[PDB]
Amino acid sequence: IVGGESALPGAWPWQVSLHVQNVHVCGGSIITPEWIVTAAHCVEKPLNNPWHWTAFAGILRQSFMFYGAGYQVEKVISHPNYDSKTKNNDIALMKLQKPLTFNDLVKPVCLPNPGMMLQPEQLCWISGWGATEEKGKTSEVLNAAKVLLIETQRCNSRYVYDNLITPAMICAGFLQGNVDSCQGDSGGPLVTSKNNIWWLIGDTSWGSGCAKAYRPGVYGNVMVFTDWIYRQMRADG
Amino acid sequence: NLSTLLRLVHVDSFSCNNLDKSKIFGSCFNSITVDKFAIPNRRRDDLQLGSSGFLQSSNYKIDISSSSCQLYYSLPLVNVTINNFNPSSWNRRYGFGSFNLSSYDVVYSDHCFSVNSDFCPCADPSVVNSCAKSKPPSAICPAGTKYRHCDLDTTLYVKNWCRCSCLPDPISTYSPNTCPQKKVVVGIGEHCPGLGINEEKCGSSCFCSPDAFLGWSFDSCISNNRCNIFSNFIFNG
């Protein structure tokens, strides 16, 4: 997050960080208290054995324990039609073995229903634990930023990406720069304000640096993959 | 003698602002500055007392807080010529000639830009060699001005991808902060520093293409076999 500010302890209970080897790697959001939605590029073959993974939720500053007080990931399900070259279909699910009952500052986010009628220049918020300016370290405190959504036609310009954005992904951010996520902000809650309820419609997959001109942020469109998530949840139970 | 001046000239309209018209008879002044120029037929309505037009923003601005008189008059088309000279210095520095247009045509600017002394529409050819996609032409810029700002960056698999500034054009760019050419509005008694130059058609010595100059238009000035000319008279003291 570049150009943002520290996120105050308000009500944003949809950010769970997945830690392996006692170090922060990536984060994501939750929709139901039985699964965790995250990226798929961090679950590659060298990142197998999901038993050695923990989940931290409702934790702003990442210092409250040491190899304990976490949720063990039971099973990880990745998208079958995943390509490592173009980085398409970057959506993965991780099921926890704990019930994770609802408490203070614990509330999931509902999935976007088909037919949201989203505006072209829609305002959204981004958050995550990444660098500060460029090639930095993991942020100790939780920060957030405000971005705008851009159309896919303008994002596919020859001077921006030269038609390298799949229809399953969208573009968001500012063309002038200074507002972008750096390395480490995998996933991240991308919600919007509509009907007094937030809707998760974004999922960070890749990007070309941060705070750079002509390099917007690329997010995953979970609306097309909603039926896949429903099928996986139906087949799991 | 104002009466003789109005009689010997084919006066079409004569008014004034912050000053009366016939009060000049018998009155004494310190100095009188006269600014005369032709009137385009299409943008004739942009000469009123207060208008957000392109003429008052890039060609000539009329002050409202000063006692100034306006005179729209006509001149026969016999034995008359129009001098189309560009008062820009940095434009002609890189090999700008003339518009080469027909007779009885005047040129008016719609977008005026301003640049600093350290500016060169030219890239260092040593860096452009390691470029494969969107490779702009380069040449040797004279000393005292930095070369074009271009950076080599990889998105997913493109190693030789060079992105420069001022894209696509300085008139409508995606990041005006990264391009040194900035929009400027002319003031009282100040000309336009220069017009927009397309850096993609520039570049031996850095010689930009004559068709790459944008930010101007041409229009005839023939009305009832006569040309209309506006004149502003400002009396100091």
Next chain:
Amino acid sequence: KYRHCDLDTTLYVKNWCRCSCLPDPISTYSPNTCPQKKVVVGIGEHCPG
């Protein structure tokens, strides 16, 4: 008597109609075109307007 002004054209035209000693009565362009003139107040009288 009504205010005497002169016009140029009519019937949906430019109609550059001109009036007398308008707008400023003090700093006017022609003081001999309208009856309102400046007169110095005498001895024992007030200003009539």
